[PDB]
Design a protein around this nucleic acid. Structure first.
Ligand SMILES: [Zn+2]
Lengths: 80, 344, 160
DNA sequence: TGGATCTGGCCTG
DNA sequence: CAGGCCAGATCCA
């Protein structure tokens, strides 16, 4: 279930146009993020009790706001 | 005339050219690290200790009301005499110059525990422009203490600066400044005997005189063998500055000054030409109204010092200096700067 | 216009190249100062250029996103990546990020970082190291490159 | 017995 | 595999 949640969350901040080709995924990003966070905090207390990666923090807190502000994430990435 | 190697702890990569060694009650400290201060030492000052030829750079906390100051990479240090320490200007790590004044003092001391106190002094009047490599000393004339300031190197003015020559540097004007510590005021004075600019010289203080000798002039790419004596008096009205040119000077730049005995100073290290290195030492014996420069014995330098290109250091205070020689390459890390100590 | 392959090797145009260490801050600043100078100079100007027989003018809006986490930490006046303050977008601690994990808001910016460094250097409230860091939210250096708060997709994927 | 002194762990690379 | 920050085990005057 955790892997499925991550794979549902991924296509938003990796697509050049997350507002067009992944509308349902963009809309359900918040619900998937909350599910991911609660799953971590409940079932994985042996890894995420008092410490969590800043990249998980970003993916669970800041991605939708950046999408709304800019329009896309991944077109501005460092791949080029 | 004794030369020894001093090792380093795990903070070798924290000493860069242009540091300053500041001494309080026989305890020497480090200033001017490389890179912005990390969490390991948020204050930025360091404890310099040589025991059995080994260096351990313990941090040093500040006072509650102190101001945390950026690493000055080429400042002007002064030893005021109720003991304080003066640093003014220099390069910050991001390579912009500062024109503000920091005052140092030891706030409190415990069993092998030291706390400093930093205050920021603002100057009003003819404020000297930001620069680096300049020299600051103090004079004591008729119950009044006040420090003299000279020119160094500074960037082009904000109206003649271009991006293609952003980092180009030109010597400051040879104006002699009189900055007052207890009032934060300055009066700019121009003296005819000083026509060409001077940078990275060595200056020596006495009762009511300062001896500036050596220095690099960037205008014509020469190092004059000059020697100027500046006399300051403090009447009721405005102070007066008189400069006299004396013969027998030396042609050095970015040399190291230290005190061996009372009315006794020695110049060690420096640069004679662009590709030439000052391999001799000069004993400058001061007095009441007379100066005499003679050559002392040449210390036995090792091959690493003799065949290097850059050395740098400061004054420990107790008849000792601390010069550095670059070591090996940089990719192999670990030991990158070879550090030596010299006994006078 | 709209770039078809924004992440391809065919769209990025080299502008300044050097052989210097990333973390060697002194020479990094020495080399990159002119480019930031031109950036700030031209951020509020207008460019007139001849286009096929008709003159046309250009405005410019700059967005900095192509910096990895270590570069952002170094050039935005921030601490190391292993510090208590983790995110370069909000002022939250690692522990508090672990108890909440959901609700946040972006509040960091270049001007805010500059004024936080000014507060850190001036010490206008007469506080100790810990109190001053708690006041400045982890700012201990002067930033010199302006970037927008954004997430690097490649490194986010690698870390996850 | 309360700060020094390592020391492995965690984070980005 | 280098580099930095941090909570925890020694430890010594
Ligand atoms: Zn955050």
């Amino acid at each position: 279930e955790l892997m499925d949640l991550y794979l549902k969350m991924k296509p938003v901040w990796r697509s050049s146009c997350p507002a067009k080709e992944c509308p349902e995924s963009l809309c359900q990003y918040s619900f998937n993020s909350q599910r991911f966070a609660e799953l971590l905090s409940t079932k994985f207390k042996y890894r995420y009790e008092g410490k969590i990666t800043n990249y998980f923090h970003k993916t669970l807190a800041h991605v939708p706001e950046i999408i709304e502000r800019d329009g896309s994430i991944g077109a501005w990435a460092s791949e080029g | 005339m004794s030369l020894q190697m001093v090792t380093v702890g795990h903070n070798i990569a924290l000493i860069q050219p242009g540091f300053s060694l500041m001494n309080f009650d026989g305890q020497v400290f480090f200033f001017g690290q490389k890179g912005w201060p990390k969490r390991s030492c948020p204050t930025g000052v360091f404890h310099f200790d040589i025991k059995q030829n080994h260096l351990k750079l313990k941090p040093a906390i500040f006072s509650k009301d102190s101001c945390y100051l950026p690493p000055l990479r080429y400042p002007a240090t002064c030893s005021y005499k109720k003991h304080q320490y003066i640093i003014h200007g220099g390069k910050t790590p991001n390579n912009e110059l500062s024109d503000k004044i920091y005052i140092m003092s030891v706030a409190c001391k415990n069993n092998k525990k030291v706390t400093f106190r930093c205050t920021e002094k603002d100057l009003v009047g003819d404020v000297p422009e930001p620069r680096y490599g300049h020299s600051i000393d103090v004079v004591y004339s008729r119950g009044k203490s006040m420090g003299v300031l000279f020119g160094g190197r500074s960037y082009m003015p904000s109206t003649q600066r271009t991006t293609e020559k952003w980092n180009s540097v030109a010597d400051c004007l040879p104006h002699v400044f009189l900055i007052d510590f207890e009032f934060g005021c300055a009066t700019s004075y121009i003296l005819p005997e000083l026509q060409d600019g001077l940078s990275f010289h060595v200056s020596i203080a006495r009762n009511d005189t300062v001896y500036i000798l050596g220095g690099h002039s960037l205008a014509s790419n020469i190092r004059p063998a000059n020697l100027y004596r500046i006399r300051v008096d403090l009447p009721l009205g405005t102070p007066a500055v008189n400069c006299t040119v004396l013969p027998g000077g030396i042609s050095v730049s970015s040399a190291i000054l230290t005190q061996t005995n009372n009315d006794e100073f020695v110049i060690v290290g420096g640069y004679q030409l662009e590709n030439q290195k000052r391999m001799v030492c000069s004993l400058v014996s001061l007095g009441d109204n007379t100066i005499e420069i003679s050559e002392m014995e040449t210390p036995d330098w090792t091959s690493d010092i003799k065949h290097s290109k850059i050395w740098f250091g400061s004054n420990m205070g107790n008849g000792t200096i601390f010069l550095g020689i670059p070591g090996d390459n940089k990719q192999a890390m670990s030991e990158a700067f070879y550090f030596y100590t010299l006994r006078c | 216009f709209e770039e078809p392959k924004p992440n391809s090797e065919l769209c990025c145009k080299p502008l300044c190249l050097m052989l210097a260490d990333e973390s060697d801050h002194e020479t990094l600043t020495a080399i990159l100062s002119p480019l930031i100078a031109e950036r700030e100079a031209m951020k509020s100007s207008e460019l007139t250029l001849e286009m096929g027989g008709i003159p046309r003018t250009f405005k410019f809006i700059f967005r900095g996103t192509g910096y990895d986490e270590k570069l952002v930490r170094e050039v935005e006046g921030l601490e190391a990546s292993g510090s208590v303050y983790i995110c370069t977008l909000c002022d939250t601690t690692r522990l508090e990020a672990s108890q909440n994990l959901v609700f946040h808001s972006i509040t960091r910016s270049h001007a805010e970082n500059l004024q936080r460094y000014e507060v850190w250097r001036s010490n206008p409230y007469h506080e100790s190291v810990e109190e001053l860091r708690d006041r400045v939210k982890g700012v201990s250096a002067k930033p010199f490159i302006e970037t927008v708060p954004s997430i690097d997709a490649l490194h986010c994927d690698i870390g996850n």
